[PDB]
Short mmCIF file of C-alpha atoms in Angstrom, two decimals:
data_model
loop_
_atom_site.label_atom_id
_atom_site.label_comp_id
_atom_site.label_asym_id
_atom_site.label_seq_id
_atom_site.Cartn_x
_atom_site.Cartn_y
_atom_site.Cartn_z
CA UNK A 5 -19.13 0.30 39.32
CA UNK A 6 -20.04 1.89 35.99
CA UNK A 7 -23.40 3.32 34.83
CA UNK A 8 -24.16 -0.07 33.15
CA UNK A 9 -24.29 -1.60 36.63
CA UNK A 10 -25.63 1.35 38.68
CA UNK A 11 -28.05 3.00 36.18
CA UNK A 12 -26.62 6.41 37.42
CA UNK A 13 -25.16 8.75 34.75
CA UNK A 14 -23.03 11.72 35.95
CA UNK A 15 -24.58 15.09 35.05
CA UNK A 16 -21.29 16.99 34.77
CA UNK A 17 -23.18 20.28 33.89
CA UNK A 18 -25.19 19.97 37.17
CA UNK A 19 -21.95 19.16 39.12
CA UNK A 20 -20.44 22.30 37.54
CA UNK A 21 -23.36 24.45 38.89
CA UNK A 22 -25.79 24.67 35.95
CA UNK A 23 -29.52 24.25 36.80
CA UNK A 24 -31.38 20.99 35.73
CA UNK A 25 -34.06 23.10 33.88
CA UNK A 26 -31.37 25.10 31.86
CA UNK A 27 -29.47 21.87 31.03
CA UNK A 28 -32.63 20.14 29.67
CA UNK A 29 -33.53 23.23 27.68
CA UNK A 30 -30.00 23.49 26.20
CA UNK A 31 -30.00 19.80 25.16
CA UNK A 32 -33.49 20.16 23.45
CA UNK A 33 -32.32 23.44 21.76
CA UNK A 34 -29.18 21.70 20.44
CA UNK A 35 -31.34 18.96 18.90
CA UNK A 36 -33.81 21.53 17.43
CA UNK A 37 -30.96 23.53 15.80
CA UNK A 38 -29.20 20.48 14.33
CA UNK A 39 -32.28 18.62 13.05
CA UNK A 40 -34.65 21.53 12.32
CA UNK A 41 -32.53 24.72 12.52
CA UNK A 42 -31.82 27.34 9.85
CA UNK A 43 -29.99 26.78 6.51
CA UNK A 44 -26.51 27.66 8.09
CA UNK A 45 -26.83 25.41 11.10
CA UNK A 46 -28.92 22.19 10.47
CA UNK A 47 -27.23 18.99 9.24
CA UNK A 48 -30.46 16.73 8.94
CA UNK A 49 -32.69 16.95 5.89
CA UNK A 50 -35.95 14.95 5.46
CA UNK A 51 -36.50 13.25 2.11
CA UNK A 52 -40.11 12.57 0.92
CA UNK A 53 -42.44 10.47 3.04
CA UNK A 54 -40.04 8.11 4.89
CA UNK A 55 -36.37 9.05 4.49
CA UNK A 56 -33.86 11.50 5.78
CA UNK A 57 -30.11 12.13 5.59
CA UNK A 58 -27.24 13.72 7.63
CA UNK A 59 -25.33 16.02 5.17
CA UNK A 60 -21.52 16.33 5.30
CA UNK A 61 -21.85 20.08 4.44
CA UNK A 62 -18.08 20.39 3.73
CA UNK A 63 -17.91 17.53 1.10
CA UNK A 64 -21.56 17.98 -0.14
CA UNK A 65 -22.19 14.19 0.29
CA UNK A 66 -23.85 11.79 2.78
CA UNK A 67 -21.42 9.45 4.74
CA UNK A 68 -22.21 6.23 6.53
CA UNK A 69 -20.48 7.80 9.75
CA UNK A 70 -22.93 10.67 9.56
CA UNK A 71 -25.98 8.52 9.03
CA UNK A 72 -24.95 6.23 11.90
CA UNK A 73 -24.18 9.29 14.12
CA UNK A 74 -27.63 10.72 13.36
CA UNK A 75 -29.33 7.40 14.38
CA UNK A 76 -27.35 7.29 17.64
CA UNK A 77 -28.37 10.94 18.40
CA UNK A 78 -32.06 10.14 17.55
CA UNK A 79 -32.32 6.97 19.74
CA UNK A 80 -30.56 8.69 22.74
CA UNK A 81 -33.11 11.64 22.46
CA UNK A 82 -36.12 9.25 21.98
CA UNK A 83 -36.76 10.63 18.41
CA UNK A 84 -38.13 7.48 16.64
CA UNK A 85 -39.57 9.29 13.55
CA UNK A 86 -36.10 10.83 12.68
CA UNK A 87 -34.28 7.47 13.57
CA UNK A 88 -36.63 5.56 11.17
CA UNK A 89 -36.12 8.16 8.29
CA UNK A 90 -32.29 7.94 8.69
CA UNK A 91 -32.27 4.13 8.98
CA UNK A 92 -34.59 3.81 5.88
CA UNK A 93 -32.20 6.04 3.82
CA UNK A 94 -29.10 3.97 4.88
CA UNK A 95 -30.89 0.63 4.32
CA UNK A 96 -32.43 1.77 0.96
CA UNK A 97 -29.41 3.45 -0.72
CA UNK A 98 -26.22 2.52 1.15
CA UNK A 99 -26.36 -1.12 2.35
CA UNK A 100 -25.02 -3.74 -0.12
CA UNK A 101 -27.38 -6.72 -0.92
CA UNK A 102 -24.56 -8.77 -2.67
CA UNK A 103 -20.84 -9.00 -3.54
CA UNK A 104 -17.67 -8.61 -1.44
CA UNK A 105 -19.35 -5.88 0.81
CA UNK A 106 -22.69 -7.73 1.36
CA UNK A 107 -24.49 -6.20 4.36
CA UNK A 108 -21.81 -3.41 4.73
CA UNK A 109 -22.71 0.23 3.77
CA UNK A 110 -21.11 2.29 0.97
CA UNK A 111 -19.04 4.88 2.96
CA UNK A 112 -20.57 7.88 0.95
CA UNK A 113 -23.27 8.70 -1.61
CA UNK A 114 -24.73 11.83 -3.24
CA UNK A 115 -27.72 13.28 -1.28
CA UNK A 116 -30.03 11.80 -4.05
CA UNK A 117 -28.72 8.31 -2.93
CA UNK A 118 -26.29 7.64 -5.84
CA UNK A 119 -23.31 5.64 -4.38
CA UNK A 120 -19.93 7.29 -4.95
CA UNK A 121 -17.72 4.26 -3.96
CA UNK A 122 -18.79 0.86 -2.62
CA UNK A 123 -16.17 0.32 0.19
CA UNK A 124 -17.22 0.84 3.84
CA UNK A 125 -16.02 2.95 6.79
CA UNK A 126 -16.10 0.44 9.74
CA UNK A 127 -16.98 3.11 12.27
CA UNK A 128 -20.26 3.51 10.42
CA UNK A 129 -21.20 -0.19 10.85
CA UNK A 130 -20.36 -0.20 14.55
CA UNK A 131 -22.55 2.88 15.29
CA UNK A 132 -25.37 1.51 13.08
CA UNK A 133 -25.35 -1.78 15.07
CA UNK A 134 -25.18 -0.03 18.54
CA UNK A 135 -27.98 2.47 17.60
CA UNK A 136 -30.19 -0.37 16.28
CA UNK A 137 -29.73 -2.50 19.45
CA UNK A 138 -30.73 0.61 21.50
CA UNK A 139 -33.76 1.15 19.10
CA UNK A 140 -34.83 -2.53 19.74
CA UNK A 141 -34.42 -2.19 23.47
CA UNK A 142 -36.15 1.21 23.80
CA UNK A 143 -38.95 0.83 21.26
CA UNK A 144 -39.20 -2.88 20.12
CA UNK A 145 -38.81 -4.51 16.70
CA UNK A 146 -41.21 -3.84 13.81
CA UNK A 147 -41.38 -5.49 10.30
CA UNK A 148 -38.26 -5.25 8.01
CA UNK A 149 -36.42 -3.04 7.67
CA UNK A 150 -37.43 -1.78 11.20
CA UNK A 151 -36.75 -5.23 12.74
CA UNK A 152 -33.89 -3.40 14.62
CA UNK A 153 -32.31 -6.29 16.59
CA UNK A 154 -32.17 -8.62 13.47
CA UNK A 155 -30.76 -5.73 11.39
CA UNK A 156 -28.03 -5.04 14.06
CA UNK A 157 -27.13 -8.77 14.21
CA UNK A 158 -26.94 -8.95 10.39
CA UNK A 159 -24.41 -6.06 10.28
CA UNK A 160 -22.20 -7.53 13.10
CA UNK A 161 -22.42 -11.02 11.47
CA UNK A 162 -20.89 -9.51 8.26
CA UNK A 163 -18.31 -7.53 10.31
CA UNK A 164 -16.91 -10.79 11.67
CA UNK A 165 -17.76 -13.40 9.02
CA UNK A 166 -17.58 -11.50 5.66
CA UNK A 167 -14.57 -13.77 4.52
CA UNK A 168 -16.74 -16.85 4.97
CA UNK A 169 -19.75 -15.32 3.21
CA UNK A 170 -17.75 -14.74 -0.06
CA UNK A 171 -14.59 -13.05 -1.47
CA UNK A 172 -14.59 -10.01 0.87
CA UNK A 173 -12.89 -9.44 4.25
CA UNK A 174 -14.08 -9.02 7.88
CA UNK A 175 -13.77 -5.65 9.62
CA UNK A 176 -11.91 -7.18 12.62
CA UNK A 177 -8.59 -8.92 12.35
CA UNK A 178 -9.29 -12.41 13.76
CA UNK A 179 -5.71 -12.88 15.11
CA UNK A 180 -5.69 -9.82 17.42
CA UNK A 181 -9.50 -8.97 17.82
CA UNK A 182 -8.85 -5.34 16.55
CA UNK A 183 -10.97 -3.32 14.19
CA UNK A 184 -9.26 -2.32 10.92
CA UNK A 185 -9.18 0.99 9.14
CA UNK A 186 -10.81 -0.72 6.09
CA UNK A 187 -11.39 -4.50 5.61
CA UNK A 188 -8.52 -4.91 3.13
CA UNK A 189 -5.69 -3.03 4.96
CA UNK A 190 -3.47 -4.40 7.84
CA UNK A 191 -3.65 -1.37 10.23
CA UNK A 192 -6.23 0.41 12.40
CA UNK A 193 -7.63 3.90 13.29
CA UNK A 194 -7.65 4.35 17.15
CA UNK A 195 -10.87 6.49 16.95
CA UNK A 196 -12.75 3.34 15.65
CA UNK A 197 -12.07 1.45 18.96
CA UNK A 198 -15.34 1.35 21.04
CA UNK A 199 -14.72 -1.21 23.81
CA UNK A 200 -17.88 -0.03 25.53
CA UNK A 201 -19.99 -0.86 22.38
CA UNK A 202 -18.29 -4.32 22.19
CA UNK A 203 -19.25 -5.06 25.79
CA UNK A 204 -22.90 -4.61 24.70
CA UNK A 205 -22.35 -6.58 21.43
CA UNK A 206 -21.17 -9.38 23.82
CA UNK A 207 -24.74 -9.20 25.25
CA UNK A 208 -26.91 -8.49 22.10
CA UNK A 209 -25.15 -9.99 19.05
CA UNK A 210 -25.60 -13.55 17.66
CA UNK A 211 -24.89 -15.96 20.51
CA UNK A 212 -21.96 -17.56 18.43
CA UNK A 213 -20.00 -14.23 18.37
CA UNK A 214 -20.49 -13.13 22.05
CA UNK A 215 -17.12 -14.52 23.25
CA UNK A 216 -15.35 -12.71 20.41
CA UNK A 217 -17.06 -9.37 21.27
CA UNK A 218 -16.01 -9.73 24.94
CA UNK A 219 -12.39 -10.37 23.84
CA UNK A 220 -12.64 -7.45 21.41
CA UNK A 221 -13.53 -5.12 24.37
CA UNK A 222 -10.40 -6.16 26.24
CA UNK A 223 -8.19 -6.04 23.12
CA UNK A 224 -9.39 -2.48 22.29
CA UNK A 225 -8.82 -1.14 25.85
CA UNK A 226 -5.28 -2.55 25.68
CA UNK A 227 -4.85 -1.22 22.06
CA UNK A 228 -5.71 2.32 23.10
CA UNK A 229 -3.03 2.14 25.94
CA UNK A 230 -0.52 1.53 23.09
CA UNK A 231 -1.80 4.14 20.67
CA UNK A 232 -2.18 7.20 23.00
CA UNK A 233 1.04 9.14 23.61
CA UNK A 234 2.14 8.61 27.26
CA UNK A 235 3.00 12.32 27.79
CA UNK A 236 0.39 14.30 25.67
CA UNK A 237 -2.55 11.82 25.53
CA UNK A 238 -2.53 12.52 21.72
CA UNK A 239 -3.02 9.70 19.21
CA UNK A 240 -2.37 9.34 15.46
CA UNK A 241 -5.30 9.21 13.08
CA UNK A 242 -4.08 5.81 11.66
CA UNK A 243 -2.03 3.35 13.75
CA UNK A 244 -0.39 -0.06 13.25
CA UNK A 245 -1.65 -3.06 15.32
CA UNK A 246 1.24 -2.31 17.72
CA UNK A 247 -0.04 1.27 18.38
CA UNK A 248 2.71 3.21 16.49
CA UNK A 249 1.64 5.61 13.67
CA UNK A 250 0.93 3.77 10.38
CA UNK A 251 3.06 4.70 7.41
CA UNK A 252 2.14 7.60 5.18
CA UNK A 253 -0.68 6.51 2.95
CA UNK A 254 -1.35 7.20 -0.79
CA UNK A 255 -4.30 9.51 0.21
CA UNK A 256 -2.33 11.42 2.92
CA UNK A 257 -0.19 11.56 6.09
CA UNK A 258 -2.34 10.28 9.01
CA UNK A 259 0.54 9.95 11.53
CA UNK A 260 -0.56 13.15 13.44
CA UNK A 261 -3.28 14.36 15.79
CA UNK A 262 -6.10 15.65 13.57
CA UNK A 263 -9.95 15.24 12.92
CA UNK A 264 -10.33 11.40 13.23
CA UNK A 265 -8.14 11.27 16.46
CA UNK A 266 -10.35 13.77 18.40
CA UNK A 267 -12.92 11.00 19.18
CA UNK A 268 -10.43 8.87 21.08
CA UNK A 269 -10.71 11.02 24.19
CA UNK A 270 -14.52 10.95 23.94
CA UNK A 271 -14.55 7.14 23.43
CA UNK A 272 -12.15 6.46 26.42
CA UNK A 273 -14.24 8.68 28.70
CA UNK A 274 -17.61 7.10 27.84
CA UNK A 275 -16.16 3.51 28.38
CA UNK A 276 -14.95 4.74 31.78
CA UNK A 277 -18.44 6.13 32.60
CA UNK A 278 -20.38 3.06 31.35
CA UNK A 279 -17.98 0.17 32.58
CA UNK A 280 -15.35 1.81 34.80
CA UNK A 281 -12.90 -1.04 33.99
CA UNK A 282 -9.48 0.57 33.19
CA UNK A 283 -8.09 3.29 35.48
CA UNK A 284 -5.46 4.32 32.84
CA UNK A 285 -8.53 5.96 31.23
CA UNK A 286 -8.64 8.56 34.03
CA UNK A 287 -4.94 9.50 33.45
CA UNK A 288 -5.31 9.55 29.61
CA UNK A 289 -8.28 11.93 30.12
CA UNK A 290 -6.16 14.17 32.54
CA UNK A 291 -3.22 14.12 29.98
CA UNK A 292 -5.19 15.39 26.91
CA UNK A 293 -6.98 18.04 29.04
CA UNK A 294 -3.60 19.14 30.55
CA UNK A 295 -2.14 19.30 26.88
CA UNK A 296 -4.95 21.67 25.77
CA UNK A 297 -5.54 23.51 29.06
CA UNK A 298 -3.67 26.68 28.02
CA UNK A 299 -4.42 26.59 24.22
CA UNK A 300 -7.21 28.86 22.85
CA UNK A 301 -9.77 26.93 20.67
CA UNK A 302 -9.20 29.52 17.82
CA UNK A 303 -5.42 28.51 18.01
CA UNK A 304 -5.85 24.67 17.82
CA UNK A 305 -3.53 23.19 15.15
CA UNK A 306 -2.59 19.85 13.70
CA UNK A 307 -0.08 18.36 16.24
CA UNK A 308 2.58 15.65 16.12
CA UNK A 309 1.55 13.06 18.77
CA UNK A 310 4.57 14.19 20.94
CA UNK A 311 2.75 17.65 21.00
CA UNK A 312 4.69 19.74 18.39
CA UNK A 313 2.26 22.20 16.74
CA UNK A 314 2.08 22.49 12.91
CA UNK A 315 1.44 25.95 11.38
CA UNK A 316 -1.73 24.38 9.96
CA UNK A 317 -4.90 25.06 11.94
CA UNK A 318 -7.39 22.28 13.05
CA UNK A 319 -10.18 21.96 10.44
CA UNK A 320 -12.79 21.18 13.25
CA UNK A 321 -11.55 23.14 16.37
CA UNK A 322 -15.09 23.19 17.91
CA UNK A 323 -15.15 19.35 17.41
CA UNK A 324 -11.73 19.10 19.20
CA UNK A 325 -13.02 21.26 22.10
CA UNK A 326 -16.15 19.03 22.32
CA UNK A 327 -14.06 15.83 22.66
CA UNK A 328 -11.63 17.52 25.15
CA UNK A 329 -14.73 18.50 27.32
CA UNK A 330 -16.25 14.91 26.97
CA UNK A 331 -13.02 13.68 28.62
CA UNK A 332 -14.40 15.24 31.86
CA UNK A 333 -16.52 12.01 32.14
CA UNK A 334 -13.20 10.40 33.33
CA UNK A 335 -10.69 13.25 34.10
CA UNK A 336 -10.30 14.23 37.83
CA UNK A 337 -7.51 16.80 37.30
CA UNK A 338 -7.45 20.59 37.59
CA UNK A 339 -8.84 21.28 34.00
CA UNK A 340 -12.00 19.03 34.07
CA UNK A 341 -14.41 21.69 35.32
CA UNK A 342 -12.87 24.49 33.04
CA UNK A 343 -13.55 22.30 29.90
CA UNK A 344 -17.17 21.67 30.96
CA UNK A 345 -17.78 25.43 31.32
CA UNK A 346 -15.85 26.34 28.15
CA UNK A 347 -18.05 23.75 26.24
CA UNK A 348 -21.24 25.21 27.80
CA UNK A 349 -20.22 28.69 26.45
CA UNK A 350 -19.47 27.42 22.97
CA UNK A 351 -22.30 27.53 20.45
CA UNK A 352 -22.88 25.10 17.44
CA UNK A 353 -20.67 25.72 14.42
CA UNK A 354 -22.31 27.48 11.42
CA UNK A 355 -21.60 27.54 7.68
CA UNK A 356 -20.03 25.17 5.18
CA UNK A 357 -17.76 23.34 7.54
CA UNK A 358 -20.20 22.75 10.40
CA UNK A 359 -20.86 19.00 9.94
CA UNK A 360 -18.07 17.22 11.79
CA UNK A 361 -17.82 19.78 14.60
CA UNK A 362 -21.57 19.68 15.23
CA UNK A 363 -21.77 15.81 15.39
CA UNK A 364 -18.93 15.75 18.03
CA UNK A 365 -20.67 18.70 19.81
CA UNK A 366 -24.03 16.89 20.11
CA UNK A 367 -22.54 13.77 21.60
CA UNK A 368 -20.62 15.86 24.22
CA UNK A 369 -23.92 17.73 25.03
CA UNK A 370 -25.59 14.30 25.62
CA UNK A 371 -22.70 12.89 27.70
CA UNK A 372 -22.06 15.93 29.92
CA UNK A 373 -25.84 16.26 30.66
CA UNK A 374 -25.99 12.57 31.68
CA UNK A 375 -28.04 11.55 28.64
CA UNK A 376 -25.61 9.29 26.73
CA UNK A 377 -26.98 6.06 28.15
CA UNK A 378 -27.08 2.31 27.72
CA UNK A 379 -30.64 1.11 26.86
CA UNK A 380 -30.94 -2.40 28.19
CA UNK A 381 -33.08 -5.59 27.68
#
C-alpha cells in the first residue's frame, strides 16, 4: 500500500543515516535560500502588497511552470502568504478570461505581468490544479480568487472541455486519455504525465470528470512504460502517442534526453510512493540510476535515449542529479543510497542559470525528507 492509504511517507535521508533535526533544518534552509536568499540564489520575488513571482533567471521571464511549481512548494511547506502572492500573480496577469485559451494561463510573461504569448504549457495547469486542491484541503477556501477548490475545478474543466467552451482545444486527447504537449499538436511530452495527480483529480475534480481522471491515471502509467527506454530508462523530451520520439520540431530537436525529460524519473518515483500500483516503476528507477551511477554530475551531457552521449553538456546538471536522486523513492538497486548522499552533499545552484535546477532540487529535498505529501479531505 502507498502513502495515500497508509499516511506514512519514507524519509530516505533518515534511512540513509542523517539525523531528523539536521534533515528538518536543511529543508527549512533550502526554502529560506530559494524564497528569501541572496541575489545569486533566490528565485522568488514579492511584488507590492499582494503578489509575487518565480523568475526564470536564464530567460528573464516568468513561466506558468515556475509559478505553479512555486505554489506546490509553498503548500507542501505550509507557507500560505507566499502561496497566495504567487496565485494572485498567476490569476491577475496570466489566466485568460476569454477566447480560445479561456481559463488557461499564458505560458510566459515579463516580470511586470505583460504577456509574451497567449498559448499555455499544460504542465503549468496540472500543477496549479493539484496545488490549489492541496491549498483547499490544508487551509480551506476563501473569497475569489482564493476559493481554491473552485479555482482548481475551473482549470481542470477547461483542460478537458475547452473544445466545447469555444474554438480552442482540450489539453488531453479524448481518444487515448493522454496529455498533449500543447492543445493544438498531436503528440505528448512524457515529463507532463502525472498519474499520481490524476488519481487525486479523480477524487477532487468536478463529479462529471472523475471517471476520465481515473482512466487518465491508468493511461499515463501505461504511456510511460512505452516512452522510457527499456535498457537506459531514458525518455525523449517529446514523444508520439505510441511512446516513440516525436519528429524534429520547427523550434528544435526534442528526440533526446535533456531538461524536460529529467522530471520523468521524479514523477514515476512519487507515483510509486503515493499509490504503489505499477512495479515496473521500481525497475525504471533502478535503470536510470544504473545509467548515471558512474557519471560525474559535472560530466552530464545530452544523451540519445539508447544512452549515446553528445559532446554537448546538460544545461541543468544539478536538476538531473536531483531527479536521479528522487528516483530513490522507488529504486531498490545498488545505487539508491549513493544518489541520496550525493544529493545531500550538493548545494543549490547559483547565478544566471539557477532557476530550473533549483526547482527540481527543492522537490527532491521535499520528497527525500518525507515531506512531498498528499493533503486529503
